[PDB]
Design a protein around this ligand. Structure first.
Ligand SMILES: [Zn+2]
Ligand SMILES: [Zn+2]
Ligand SMILES: [Zn+2]
Ligand SMILES: [Zn+2]
Ligand SMILES: [Zn+2]
Ligand SMILES: [Zn+2]
Ligand SMILES: [Zn+2]
Lengths: 187, 529, 72, 588, 201, 186
RNA sequence: AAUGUCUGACUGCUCCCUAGCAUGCUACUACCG
RNA sequence: GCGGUAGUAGCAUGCUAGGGAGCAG
């Protein structure tokens, strides 16, 4: 703040002050000079500070509106992300079997917990120990949920492949033990 | 969801060797002593999450005695008529820490700040209006806690999606904040224990009984064994404050949403979705308050069973038979409410069984001779009630009892009470368990809390918590506090030393000397500000 | 004294875990088992034998060159 | 806060105008500031007059008036000169040593590293100044050749959001943490810096984010000169203390040796007879054979193999795959593809295969450093840092191609100047020698031995009658960054039409675009001399397009001519290398 | 909502909402757009309106930037400056905004009505961005013109090929042409369904 | 705040005011030395204030950068600080079994599993060369972890079962140096 | 070549640091009545 | 000689906001 009209008036007031006080003349001179200094600092009491308030309010409004622009930008971004996720998830389900089991529903409104129980293709079985492996995932195929499942890969905790041979009664205490059995719907 | 189940593990804590060396140098941790190390950072191995989610098998279908329930619900409601609730617009909610997790699937794209910052007030009010007419099931995620404890079971907390909290807030916040700002009530949530708060709370609960004894109990597996009916009852009692804002169908749909979101919804433990059978999910929008409601319910039910299961002819006072007789009336013979009976019975309870309730953690100051005769409830009634209405067996090794009414509570909110003469009168004070404070001092989460130089502030907080030990008649106990003070002094000295060393400056002014002098601390417990 | 055993067991488990041992599965289960058993023990002797059994793990590997730190 | 990099006496001062900003005791800092162009010292605070605008950065013109720093025209009546009494006003002034020959670092700091004599200077001082010269040479490279950076801001947006603009055509450097610039605001007057500044691009240009050292207001008329910036400080030795052992110290040699490595059992023992060994293995002499026979001779040992490029590490990997069990070998990959048949990244292993930049931090029985030719003192530093083995093996041949010194423009680095292990191979000489060239024909072996092997490379296979040469200059045409000899390529085409069995030959040239235009006309496989190092072919066609010190480089010519298994043709633009080449000449 | 000026391409988030398509104008360009033509409505990412309740004054020239919002001359705060000053409207990028004087053809397209030939003459002989803007504006105007039409109820369906279609009351009927394709609507009572698209002749 | 030219100004003001009050001056002269001394305080308080503000600002900047440097440099070196702390603790414990196995390991004898505790459950050990075999395996007994073990099988590096009496100082070069012993608990 | 990201619930209370604003209190200076 | 307003600094209290931490259910 230096190129200010009130500051130019302040400057010429100080100039007349130093001039007419350097040539010391009368008391009226000093009186008018002090009054002029007062009016000059009255000019530069506001033109020096109120414009700083203008500046601070402009800056806070500008920063706020930048942050608002950021808000709307990240808004559009998360919108795009959500919709692409929805589309890619959908493009994995539309087997006509689903359409079929929905048609055979008298109103179109079916429960959810049975959709993967009928129309899903892959199975994942988690078995705690050997004895449970005996009762349920035996041979290269087994029957669950009224369908046949052909076993296709087995892994352990570290997820390291385990052929069906190693699941011996006696080899058992040599692997991690929640074993993950992946299967496929036979047909 | 994805092709391989994830196995989550829990790491062990971190050791602060400097403090341990200090404490053994000053003669602590002696063999056979009382104070010791009992609180550690227990580690868990692979299938920890699922082995703790499996604890829901203690939740079984439970059918409630409908008539006595329909009466106790009225009395419980009467315990709750000093507050005010109702819907509020989006531009009046108060969210502290907008920087927490936003549940599953939202946590893939930022914290709650994003969604609370990308939806104008119109969208939020529209979402509310929508759930007032529809149902939105949600997914809940299960997270493993990592904090000090004294029992080596894992602990989990449920993280509810943003769609649930963003609306439950607008539905309940007015009543919640109105509860958290009332003094002298029965529910004591929001009442600070500093600056004499403990004394006022104890005096209020004491409150004019005749032959006072104390008593406190404990629910085993509280959050996993609560049956659905009492949870629904609690939600209804909370929503009772909505007679004008909402219309009737709106209230039912809000009930349905809250049920389908926090009572029996899918849970994303591990990496797969399971089905939660029942019981609360400790992390929703209104846990502590609903637990308080359920607590008061069980207390009232026990009093009712006590009074009804006693022989009439053995009753001396005519007014008490009148009470028991007409209570059987209003329970089974009648069909609809009778306000005056409820009123005078509630007043009777307020005279013979005063209570202090924080969430599932109670203290009771009750007549003793009435209890002996069988006109209020003693521990045995609580045991029977929990058995047939909660499906758990409350062992009597966890239910304390007190006779002299001058040594407080035995224990409430895991604090003990001591009656100390301060200034010129005799006030109550709370003091923790010393092994807890020492454990907190020695074992820290991250390795930057293991360099006392940077973090003196937490030692200040710990000392503020440890102060009231100084008034204990024992002797190791006061030495705890004094050890903390001398530690703070040592830290400040070595810090100035280091600073002068690496650069050569000395600080100009500190005003830290008030931290190792024991009036700054005692200010907290005596009464002003 | 017993507190010293509990404390060094905490530090040892921390070192093991930061040496990536939790990648393997059954081994980490055993280490966690021994650590949680030591933290709850009451008498010093059996705690010491669990301590040696658990230190054997760190010794069985060649990630930490003890011949360096054993210089006093 | 540190130790005087010359004196180890503890210093709190850093040399401002100096590129690395090192620690110099009051006496050493004094010596540098009076003996060089460095007049700026950096301590807790930068040394400058703090009067408004007084940009007095001369260390000799500052005086401690009051609590702030002052010039002469600013010092209040209470002060004194810092730069006085042979030392500077710096902490630990009494415990100052003052190096005797500061001229060493005084020359290492004020040079350009484009002259070979500066490399001699680096090679010919103590190990501390050796690693110092290493850091400063990598710093000179990055500040010159490796990427750049000045940008002038367009306008301010927020506290950390700013519009920028580089100078149209000026190198626009990437925006990373290892890229900071000196922020200059010039009032008119007042060429004052506002600190050091890294930048990063956000989700919209050009309002980017910046992290600033100082917390000053960034004006719109500012600009950020690229600084002498980004390296990694070196604190690791180079050639460990050589300790010859009279016994195979710490190795258990096998009870049964194979014939393939029977040619080197005394060699492996002599490796065991010393702290570290250096062997000279010419191309196609069985360097990988020796390398795997090292471990096959001591079966109960933990060995780690390393080399510069991924290609040589992978070559040792396949050689091991043939001779070393897969379960005990391990390929280490950085976060480009390479070997993976071995278990990828396994530190607790008997055989570790990792490049010099991707070494882990552990111990071993032996670290066999392959490709010593491309090795520099930084590489030795890092291999001694990341690995602590009781024995080291520096396999290779300094007469082969080195690591390129791109910032070097004038001069030729003698193989003695590629490193210091190669220096010892040109002084004390290689401890051993692979004296059986099982790749090149008798002509090519006698050629490379009379050239850069001193007649000492023996010809396994005999005169193949297919190593040819042609003295043809051609017309040397230059495109942007190569040289293309179309008439040379023309006589090569005439050879192909005359020798259709030589259509399988590998076109070789000292450049890339000559290779490219040859392929565009010949169609043959055209590779460069450096890329062919580590590759051997049946028939070769080498067309020395130019006669520059690059094309006529005896290391380059040596390795390029050794690329042949059966025969080779050489269209020679130079006559010296033509006559030194003992091949079957041809008519144009 | 930050972009390049449609005339000088300096970054900007200024638009004059009274223009139908709302293009990105620089500070100088937006000032020239608002002082000369009838677009007395300017908006950045936030609207420029007297945020006082009850005061719905529209033009920016009579607005004053207050504490946090922009207020009229009346409900102005004492400490406030206007939004039209020195030929730049208060928005982002005040100092790097360059502008120019090509506001002539800009006002010509932003004030035209496309009912005459000369408008299309100028729209074909203007600058590239101006040409795309003119195309956009005339497409929006013809879309609004076609939507200014209305309905057409069926009197009798003679066949799939012959139709007895009467058009809206007091409405200029659309001529028998191929371009105007008609979508059909049949309400159950309750749920008007789109019965397809149909062409006439 | 002494090192100020404003300090000299204010001090001259105080001295002149003292002269005015001590010389018995008139009424208006002390007003000149009160209005000027009070404008002098209104400037001196102000400059001392701003300078102490800038000082404390620099000071808190210093403490902040110090905190940062400390934290980061410690986070850098946990992987070694933990090891040295662990081993000083182990040495301070001072038990027989711990020290036994630590010394065996610093020589070269390391187990190949977890040292069991029951009398069953095998235990395997690596022996580097035969001297430690002299200091340890004496006959059919085996002393490890200060407990007694029965040798049940030996083998050298090339998986060759090696008879007990087969080993001796003379025949020592007739075996792969890293022998392996499989013992049980007493 | 990238860069970048990794599980942390709902409440209540308390201490510490910083910022802002107003208000409130006191002093210094200025103008006018 | 008083009042008033305006300024500036100092000081306090309170409220909001931002950050770091502790305990409790
Ligand atoms: Zn409502
Ligand atoms: Zn020195
Ligand atoms: Zn220098
Ligand atoms: Zn100066
Ligand atoms: Zn317009
Ligand atoms: Zn423009
Ligand atoms: Zn208005």
């Amino acid at each position: 703040f230096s190129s200010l009209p009130s500051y130019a008036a302040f400057a010429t007031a100080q100039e007349a002050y130093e001039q007419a006080v350097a040539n010391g003349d009368s008391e009226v001179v000093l009186k008018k000079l002090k009054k002029s200094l007062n009016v000059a600092k009255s000019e530069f009491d506001r033109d020096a500070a109120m414009q700083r308030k203008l500046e601070k309010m402009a800056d806070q409004a500008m920063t706020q509106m930048y942050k608002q622009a950021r808000s709307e930008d990240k808004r559009a971004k998360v919108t795009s992300a959500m919709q692409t996720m929805l589309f890619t998830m959908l493009r994995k389900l539309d087997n006509d079997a689903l359409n079929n089991i929905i048609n055979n529903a008298r109103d179109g409104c079916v429960p959810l917990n049975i959709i993967p129980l009928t129309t899903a293709a892959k199975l994942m079985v988690v078995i705690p120990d050997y004895n449970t492996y005996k009762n349920t995932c035996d041979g290269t195929t087994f029957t669950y949920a009224s369908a046949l499942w052909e076993i296709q890969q087995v892994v352990d905790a570290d997820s390291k492949i385990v052929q069906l041979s190693e699941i011996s009664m006696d080899n058992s205490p040599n692997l991690a033990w929640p074993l993950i059995v992946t299967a496929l719907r036979a047909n | 969801l994805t092709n391989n189940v994830a196995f989550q593990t829990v790491k062990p804590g971190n050791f602060n060797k400097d403090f341990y060396d200090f404490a053994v140098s000053k003669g602590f941790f002696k063999e056979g002593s009382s104070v010791e190390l009992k609180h550690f950072f227990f580690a868990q191995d692979g299938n920890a999450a699922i082995s703790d989610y499996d604890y829901y098998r203690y939740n079984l279908p439970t059918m409630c005695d409908i008539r006595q329930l329909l009466f106790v619900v009225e009395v419980v409601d009467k315990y709750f008529d000093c507050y005010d609730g109702g819907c509020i617009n989006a531009n009046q909610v108060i969210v502290n820490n907008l920087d927490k997790s936003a549940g599953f699937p939202f946590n893939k794209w930022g914290k709650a700040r994003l969604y609370y910052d990308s939806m104008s007030y119109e969208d939020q009010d529209a979402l509310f209006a929508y759930t007032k007419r529809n149902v939105i099931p949600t997914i809940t995620q299960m997270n493993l806690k990592y904090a000090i404890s004294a029992k080596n079971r894992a602990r989990t907390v449920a993280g509810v999606s943003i769609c649930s909290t963003m609306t439950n807030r607008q539905f309940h916040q007015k009543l919640l904040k109105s509860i958290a700002a009332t003094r002298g009530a029965t529910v004591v949530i929001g009442t600070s224990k500093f600056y004499g708060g403990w004394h006022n709370m104890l005096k209020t609960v004491y409150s004019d009984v005749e032959n006072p004894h104390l008593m406190g109990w404990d629910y085993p597996k509280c959050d996993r064994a609560m049956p659905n009916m009492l949870r629904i009852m609690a939600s209804l009692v909370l929503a009772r404050k909505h007679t004008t804002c909402c219309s009737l169908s709106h209230r039912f749909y809000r009930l349905a949403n809250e049920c389908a979101q926090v009572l029996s919804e899918m849970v994303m433990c591990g990496g797969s979705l399971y089905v939660k059978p029942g019981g609360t999910s400790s992390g929703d929008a209104t846990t502590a308050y609903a637990n308080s409601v359920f607590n008061i319910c069980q207390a009232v039910t026990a009093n009712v069973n006590a009074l009804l299961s006693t022989d009439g002819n053995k009753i001396a006072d005519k007014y008490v038979r009148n009470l028991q007789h007409r209570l059987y009336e209003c329970l089974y013979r009648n069909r609809d409410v009778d306000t005056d009976f409820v009123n005078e019975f509630y007043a009777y309870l307020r005279k013979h069984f005063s209570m202090m309730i924080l969430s599932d953690d109670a203290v009771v100051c009750f007549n003793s001779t009435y209890a002996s005769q069988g006109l209020v409830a003693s521990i045995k009634n609580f045991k029977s009630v929990l058995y047939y209405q909660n499906n758990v067996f409350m062992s009597e090794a966890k239910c304390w009892t007190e006779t002299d009414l001058t040594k407080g509570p035995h224990e409430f909110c895991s604090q003990h009470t001591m009656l100390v003469k301060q200034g010129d009168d005799y006030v109550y004070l709370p003091y923790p368990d010393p092994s807890r404070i020492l454990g907190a001092g020695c074992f820290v989460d991250d390795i930057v809390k293991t360099d006392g130089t940077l973090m003196i502030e937490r030692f200040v907080s710990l000392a503020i918590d440890a102060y009231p030990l100084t008034k204990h008649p024992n002797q190791e106990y006061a030495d705890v506090f004094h050890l903390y003070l001398q530690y703070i002094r040592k830290l400040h000295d070595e810090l100035t030393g280091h600073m002068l060393d690496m650069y050569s400056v000395m600080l100009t002014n500190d005003n830290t000397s008030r931290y190792w002098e024991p009036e700054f601390y005692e200010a907290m417990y005596t009464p002003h500000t | 004294k017993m507190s010293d055993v509990k404390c060094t067991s905490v530090v040892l488990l921390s070192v093991l875990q930061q040496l990536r041992v939790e990648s393997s599965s059954k081994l980490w289960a055993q280490c966690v088992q021994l650590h949680n058993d030591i933290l709850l023990a009451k008498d010093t002797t059996e705690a010491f034998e669990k301590m040696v059994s658990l230190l054997s793990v760190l010794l069985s590997m060649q990630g930490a060159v003890d011949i360096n730190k054993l210089c006093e | 806060v540190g130790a005087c990099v010359l004196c180890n006496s503890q210093t709190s001062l850093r040399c401002g105008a100096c590129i690395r900003r090192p620690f110099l005791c009051c006496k050493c800092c004094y010596d540098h500031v009076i003996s060089t162009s460095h007049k700026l010292v950096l301590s807790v605070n930068p040394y400058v007059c703090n009067a408004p605008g007084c940009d007095v950065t001369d260390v000799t013109q500052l005086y401690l008036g009051g609590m702030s720093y002052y010039c002469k025209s600013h010092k209040p009546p209470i002060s004194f000169p810092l730069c006085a009494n042979g030392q500077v006003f710096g902490l630990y002034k009494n415990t100052c040593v003052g190096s005797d020959n500061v001229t060493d670092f005084n020359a290492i700091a004020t040079c350009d590293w484009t002259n070979a004599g500066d490399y001699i200077l680096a090679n010919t001082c103590t190990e501390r100044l050796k690693l110092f010269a290493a850091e400063t040479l990598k710093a000179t490279e990055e500040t010159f050749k490796l990427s750049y950076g000045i940008a002038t801001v367009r306008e301010v947006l927020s506290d950390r959001e700013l519009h920028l603009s580089w100078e149209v055509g000026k190198p626009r450097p990437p925006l990373n943490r290892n890229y900071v610039f000196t922020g200059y605001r010039v009032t008119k007057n007042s060429k004052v810096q506002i600190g050091e500044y890294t930048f990063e691009k956000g989700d919209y240009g050009d309002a980017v984010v910046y992290r600033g050292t100082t917390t000053y207001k960034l004006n719109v008329g500012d600009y950020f000169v690229l600084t002498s910036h980004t390296v990694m400080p070196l604190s690791a030795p180079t050639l460990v203390p050589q300790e010859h052992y009279v016994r195979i110290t710490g190795l258990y040699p096998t009870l049964n040796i194979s014939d393939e490595f029977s040619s080197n059992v005394a060699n492996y023992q002599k490796v065991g007879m010393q702290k570290y060994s250096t062997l000279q293995g010419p191309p196609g002499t069985g360097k990988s054979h020796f390398a795997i026979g090292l471990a096959l001779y001591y079966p109960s040992a933990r060995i780690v193999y390393t080399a510069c490029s991924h290609a040589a590490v992978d070559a040792l990997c396949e050689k091991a795959l043939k001779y070393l069990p897969i379960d005990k070998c391990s390929r280490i990959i950085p976060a480009v593809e390479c070997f993976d048949k071995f278990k990828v990244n396994s530190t607790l292993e008997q055989y570790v295969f990792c490049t010099v930049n991707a070494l882990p931090e552990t111990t071993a029985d032996i670290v066999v450093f392959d490709e010593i030719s491309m090795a520099t003192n930084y590489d030795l530093s890092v291999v001694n840092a990341r690995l602590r083995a009781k024995h080291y093996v520096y396999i290779g041949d300094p007469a082969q191609l080195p690591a390129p010194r791109t910032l070097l423009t004038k001069g030729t680095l003698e193989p003695e100047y590629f490193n210091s292990v190669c220096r010892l191979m040109k002084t004390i000489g290689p401890d051993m020698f692979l004296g059986t060239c099982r790749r090149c024909p008798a002509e090519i072996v006698d050629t490379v031995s009379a050239l850069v092997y001193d007649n000492k490379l023996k010809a396994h296979k005999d005169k193949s009658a297919q190593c040819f040469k042609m003295f043809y200059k051609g017309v040397i045409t230059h495109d942007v960054s190569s040289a293309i000899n179309r008439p040379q390529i023309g006589v090569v085409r005439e050879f192909l039409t005359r020798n259709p069995a030589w259509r399988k030959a590998v076109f070789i040239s000292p450049y890339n675009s000559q290779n490219a235009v040859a392929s565009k006309i010949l169609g043959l496989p055209t590779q460069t001399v450096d890329s062919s190092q580590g590759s051997e072919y049946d028939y070769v066609i080498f067309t020395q397009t130019t006669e520059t010190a690059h094309s006529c480089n005896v290391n380059r010519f040596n390795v390029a001519i050794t690329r042949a298994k059966v025969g080779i043709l050489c269209i020679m633009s130079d006559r010296d290398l033509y006559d030194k080449l003992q091949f079957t000449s041809l008519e144009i | 909502a930050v972009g390049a000026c449609v005339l000088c391409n300096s970054q900007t988030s200024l638009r004059c909402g009274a223009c139908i398509r709302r293009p990105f104008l620089c500070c100088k360009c937006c000032y020239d757009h608002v002082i000369s033509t009838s677009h007395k409505l300017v908006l950045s990412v936030n609207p420029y309106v007297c945020n006082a309740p009850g005061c719905d004054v529209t033009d920016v020239t009579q607005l004053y930037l207050g504490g946090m919002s922009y207020y009229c001359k009346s409900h102005k705060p004492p400490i406030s400056f206007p939004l039209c000053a020195n030929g730049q409207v208060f928005g982002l990028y005040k100092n790097t905004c360059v502008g120019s004087d090509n506001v002539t053809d800009f006002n010509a397209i932003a004030t035209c009505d496309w009912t005459n030939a000369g408008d299309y003459i100028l729209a074909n002989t203007c600058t590239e961005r101006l040409k795309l803007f003119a195309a956009e504006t005339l497409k929006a105007t013809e879309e609004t013109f076609k939507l200014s039409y209305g309905i057409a109820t069926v009197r009798e369906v003679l066949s799939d090929r012959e139709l007895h279609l009467s058009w809206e009351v007091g409405k200029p009927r659309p001529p028998l042409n191929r371009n105007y394709v008609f979508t059909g609507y049949r309400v159950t009572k309750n749920s008007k369904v789109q019965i397809g698209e149909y062409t006439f002749e």
